[PDB]
């Protein structure tokens, strides 16, 4: 089980140095190749580059996409088992989810497993945190479904609860929406019997890390 | 230009081609060395070697 | 140089669908093989399905398989399954620019399945928003496949794209934003979802 997980600032602004950290487990840094990988929202997968383990012998230490040669570095440290990004000279078209990568060749260059981890979102804007607000969404066949509204925050990253988890079955938290305004709003919803609806309580935990807001709103 | 085009240790085999070079490419799988002969002089992926000439069924060995 | 794979493809459940990226010699023809297929689930990481030398990753399905014929890499599903629509990446390693190419992506959906007619609900904006000179009206569509729908506003008579739910049926989210004052003074706004010659419109209006 390689587990690979990204860390790093998830705000950065423009002409700025991007420095993202993946903390990897159950594959050896020091034989195994590892790198990074980018997704723009809406767009398509963009190799970033790797940094090569002891495993392939002749090749290059690093390799690199070339779009991006002279802003980016990849290095790691095999103690710490961690892998690093620095990427300088930032642009909106910097904006993108960040993977880091691991590679298990035995004989040559991507002969071997890619693992991959969850990704992290880095946004390139000159703007700065907006907290959201939470309101409720309630309305009047033997089921009825409430929610709450997160609206005009900034940066993208949010997550929803409900009950504090105690409730999964029949939540959906919806994708994000950017509107006009430069901001961004979601929704999450639970589908409950229409019964509990005068027995049981339900409140939604929303959270925003970028601007460590963590709310609690109750329908 | 003439280019070997035999793999490994199999029987040897030609080929014309219109590029100028032949090649010997090798590289290790789980018991042994793998060669791929042909012709041009191609890059490789780390962990391959590679070895071009510019004279007829000169990537024999 | 580039690889390049159709945007779309569509496939009956239980049927073969490949998907094709069309490459190089440099790239998904170089030998020694290196061709990856990941999975993508919308809003999710990629998985590897296939790599290096169309090897198979493990607890992968083995109806996932992928093959080379010149420069031409292919994945085939031997029996599509719900589960299966996704985007499908294929990358491969180029000796020339020494990078790692990707494709632009196949979406993967699934026809034929049996069809779950949507549940619509449409909230108005809460007495806070109005409060904040603003109107912000929700339209929550869930529990509808196939997972391709139409949303349509109006008044007095920014959508998201469908993503799957738990249970393996599709959902949508829908906001109409207006100013406090344009919806305080409307007479009706309505939500309208078209999905399989069906279409269900549920209304909500300036209240008190």
């Known amino acids: 089980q390689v587990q690979l997980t990204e860390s790093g600032p998830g705000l950065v602004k423009p002409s700025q140095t991007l420095s993202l950290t993946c903390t990897v487990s159950?594959?050896?840094?020091?034989?195994?190749?590892a790198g990074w990988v980018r997704q723009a929202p809406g767009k398509g997968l963009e190799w970033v580059g790797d940094?090569?383990?002891?495993?392939?012998?002749?090749?290059?230490?690093?390799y690199y996409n070339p779009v991006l040669k002279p802003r980016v570095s990849i290095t790691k440290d095999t103690s710490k088992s961690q892998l690093y990004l620095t990427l300088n000279s930032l642009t909106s078209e910097d904006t993108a989810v960040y993977y880091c990568?691991?590679?298990?060749?035995?004989?040559?260059?991507?002969?071997?497993?890619?693992?991959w981890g969850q990704g992290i979102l880095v946004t390139v804007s000159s703007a700065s945190t907006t907290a959201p607000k939470v309101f409720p969404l309630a309305s009047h066949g033997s089921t009825v479904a409430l929610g709450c509204l997160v609206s005009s925050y900034f940066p993208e990253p949010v997550t929803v609860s409900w009950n504090s988890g105690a409730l999964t079955s029949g939540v959906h938290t919806f994708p994000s929406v950017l509107q006009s305004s430069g901001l961004y709003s979601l929704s999450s919803m639970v589908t409950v019997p229409a019964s509990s609806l005068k027995s049981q309580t339900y409140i939604c935990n929303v959270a925003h890390p970028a601007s460590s807001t963590k709310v609690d709103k109750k329908i | 230009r003439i280019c070997y085009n035999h793999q490994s240790t199999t029987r040897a085999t030609t080929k014309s081609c219109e590029e100028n070079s032949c090649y010997k490419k090798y590289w290790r799988d789980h018991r042994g060395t793998i060669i791929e002969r042909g012709c041009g002089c191609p890059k490789v992926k780390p962990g391959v070697g590679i070895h071009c000439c510019q004279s007829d069924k000169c990537n024999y060995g | 140089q580039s690889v390049t794979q159709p945007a779309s493809v569509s496939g009956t459940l239980g049927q073969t669908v490949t998907i094709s990226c069309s490459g190089s010699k440099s790239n998904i023809g170089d030998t020694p093989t290196y061709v990856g297929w990941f999975q993508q689930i919308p809003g999710t990481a990629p998985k590897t399905l296939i790599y290096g030398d169309n090897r198979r990753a493990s607890g992968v399905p083995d109806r996932f398989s992928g093959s080379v014929s010149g420069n031409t890499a292919t994945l085939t599903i031997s029996g599509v399954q719900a589960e299966d629509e996704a985007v499908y990446w294929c990358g491969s390693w180029d000796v020339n620019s020494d990078s790692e190419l990707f494709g632009g992506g196949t979406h993967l959906t699934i026809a034929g399945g049996p069809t779950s007619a949507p549940s619509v609900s449409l909230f108005p904006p809460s007495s806070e928003e109005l409060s904040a000179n603003k109107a912000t009206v929700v339209c929550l569509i869930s529990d509808f496949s196939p997972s391709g729908l139409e949303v349509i506003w109006k008044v007095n008579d920014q959508t998201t794209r469908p993503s799957k739910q738990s249970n393996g049926k599709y959902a949508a989210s829908s906001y109409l934003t207006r100013t406090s004052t344009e919806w305080k003074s409307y007479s009706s706004v309505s939500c309208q979802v078209k999905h399989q010659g069906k279409t269900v419109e549920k209304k909500v209006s300036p209240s008190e």
């Open positions: 159950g594959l050896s840094l020091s034989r195994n190749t």
């Open positions: 940094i090569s383990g002891d495993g392939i012998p002749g090749g290059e230490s690093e």
């Open positions: 990568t691991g590679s298990g060749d035995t004989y040559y260059w991507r002969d071997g497993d890619r693992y």
